[PDB]
Amino acid sequence: SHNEKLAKKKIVSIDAGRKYFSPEQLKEIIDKAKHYGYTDLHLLVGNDGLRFMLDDMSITANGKTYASDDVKRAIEKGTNDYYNDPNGNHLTESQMTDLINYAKDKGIGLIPTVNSPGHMDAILNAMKELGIQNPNFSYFGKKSARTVDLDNEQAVAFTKALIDKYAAYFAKKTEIFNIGLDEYANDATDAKGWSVLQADKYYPNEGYPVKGYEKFIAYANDLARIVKSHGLKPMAFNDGIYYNSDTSFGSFDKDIIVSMWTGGWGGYDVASSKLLAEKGHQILNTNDAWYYVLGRNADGQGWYNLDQGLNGIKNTPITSVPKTEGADIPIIGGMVAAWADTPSARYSPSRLFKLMRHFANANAEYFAADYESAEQALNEVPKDLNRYTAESVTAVKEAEKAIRSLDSNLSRAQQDTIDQAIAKLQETVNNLTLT
């Protein structure tokens, strides 16, 4: 099923929420993505930091409009409070439109993430700068820097309107919008946030958040509705979706594509990919086997170091989804992810490209071949062959025909077929003999 494999999405994810990436850096990543046979760039722009500003950032919520220039000041400041990156603060609308167009012309899509209700430090800060009160979730006196309180109607309304503003921009120029949903209050609860949101149902009268997880389902579904209204497919990370396999709080919108990144860990019991598929969700395999955190560049340098990610790529194929329960889990594609958890780390293009190249090579039948050198070779053939001998001319014409007769849907596994055809053309041109 070569055609089914090549039809899958192959995606590189870049955390440009925590850390600034310039348009030039992002274009270079797009170029490499295209070369290695990827289909999409997944660009987080809201992920702790918020690093994408529309021309009009005015937000209507809470019975008022927050002025564009105030929302911009609030977000720039709020992002800087998370991390004031010396390289830059945000991409502009003009830059994003140009980047999406640049990618489109190369056959690469762009999938944005603007994360909530977790990983939203900068939006929380921005809301406080606008004057919204107490937006942050707290757990027995420990305030999350990252997560909104779903009981705070003003904070929730603002956040939804902000997501809507971005989704309206991305409408018609993208296909999928990642609303995130990972790791609720991971700081304040020591990575127990879903358990906390579920706890009051089963452990009442203990001070746990009343209707916490029910409100989360409603929030996720309302963001899904917002995204869908703009003709975009919503996507979200898996960990909070039917956490603890618990279907008793409500149901998630089936139109949410699941980015399946984790199988969970000790005391963090996530729904299996089997359960999620059976509930009607499509799955993008985002296995954290393949993760790379910038600056963790070799064995021993911490979790998700480059050597660990390269090992994960070698040992966990694109078809291996987290927590399958032994079931056959279909996928829409696979996504290798680079993250900026320590955003002051130096971004190394060569290390990212090595990760990308290894993912492509390890799953070569899924990745598109590279035809650009073949097209260049054709452009370099002498146009007029009259002055050469008939025998030598025929050989060039046959070699050109052979290139133009290559299957246009070859995989990276078949690159040598293309490269051999290029070499043969070059040989025949070199052998052109003047009459």
- Least distance CB 20 / ligand OAN (angstroms): 16
- Least distance CB 237 / ligand OAN (angstroms): 4
Task: Report whether 407 contacts 6 (CB < 8 A).
Answer: no
For ligand OAN, the binding residue among 204, 303, 330, 417 (CB under 6 A) is 303
Q: What pairing do the DSSP bridges indicate for beta strands 59-61 and 64-66?
A: antiparallel
Residues contacting 404, CB < 8 A, separation 6+: 378
Angle (nearest 5°) at CA 231 between 109 and 283: 60
For ligand OAN, the binding residue among 261, 290, 347, 388 (CB under 6 A) is 261
Task: Report whether 119 contacts 48 (CB < 8 A).
Answer: yes
Q: Which is nearer to ligand OAN, 93 or 288 (CB)?
A: 288
Stretch 95-134: interaction string toward ligand OAN, x if CB under 6 A: ------------------------x---------------
293 contacts ligand OAN (rule: CB under 6 A): yes
Q: Which is nearer to ligand OAN, 140 or 265 (CB)?
A: 265
For ligand OAN, the binding residue among 82, 137, 194, 237 (CB under 6 A) is 237
E strand or H helix at 377: helix 372-379
Cα gap 385→379, rounded to integer Å: 14
Backbone phi, then psi, for 113, in 5-degree steps? Answer: -120, 135
Residues contacting 361, CB < 8 A, separation 6+: 412
Q: Which is nearer to ligand OAN, 34 or 119 (CB)?
A: 119
Q: Which is nearer to ligand OAN, 270 or 422 (CB)?
A: 270
Angle (nearest 5°) at CA 88 between 35 and 53: 85
CB atoms within 10 A of CB 88: 14
- Least distance CB 259 / ligand OAN (angstroms): 7
Could you give the 3-state DSSP secondary structure of residue 408?
Answer: coil
Task: Report whether 23 contacts 346 (CB < 8 A).
Answer: no
- Least distance CB 412 / ligand OAN (angstroms): 26
Applying CB under 6 A, the site for ligand OAN has a residue count of 13
269 contacts ligand OAN (rule: CB under 6 A): no
- Least distance CB 195 / ligand OAN (angstroms): 14
The neighbouring-strand residues paired with 100 are none
Task: Report whether 282 contacts 258 (CB < 8 A).
Answer: yes
- In 3D space, the residue among 236, 245, 253 whose CA is nearest the CA of residue 270 turns out to be 245
What are the strands, taking DSSP E only, across 2-81?
9-15, 40-47, 49-50, 52-53, 59-61, 64-66
Q: Which residue is nearest to ligand OAN (CB)?
A: 339
183 contacts ligand OAN (rule: CB under 6 A): yes
For ligand OAN, the binding residues in 132-151 under the rule CB under 6 A are: none
Output the CA torsion 302→284→17→347 (10° steps). Answer: 50
Q: Which is nearer to ligand OAN, 258 or 332 (CB)?
A: 258
For ligand OAN, the binding residues in 203-222 under the rule CB under 6 A are: none
83 contacts ligand OAN (rule: CB under 6 A): no
Q: Which is nearer to ligand OAN, 68 or 282 (CB)?
A: 282
The neighbouring-strand residues paired with 37 are none
For ligand OAN, the binding residues in 327-356 under the rule CB under 6 A are: 339, 341
291 contacts ligand OAN (rule: CB under 6 A): yes
Q: Which is nearer to ligand OAN, 237 or 353 (CB)?
A: 237
- Least distance CB 146 / ligand OAN (angstroms): 10
- Least distance CB 419 / ligand OAN (angstroms): 36
Binding stretches for ligand OAN (CB under 6 A): 15, 119, 182-183, 237, 261, 265, 291, 293, 303-304, 339, 341
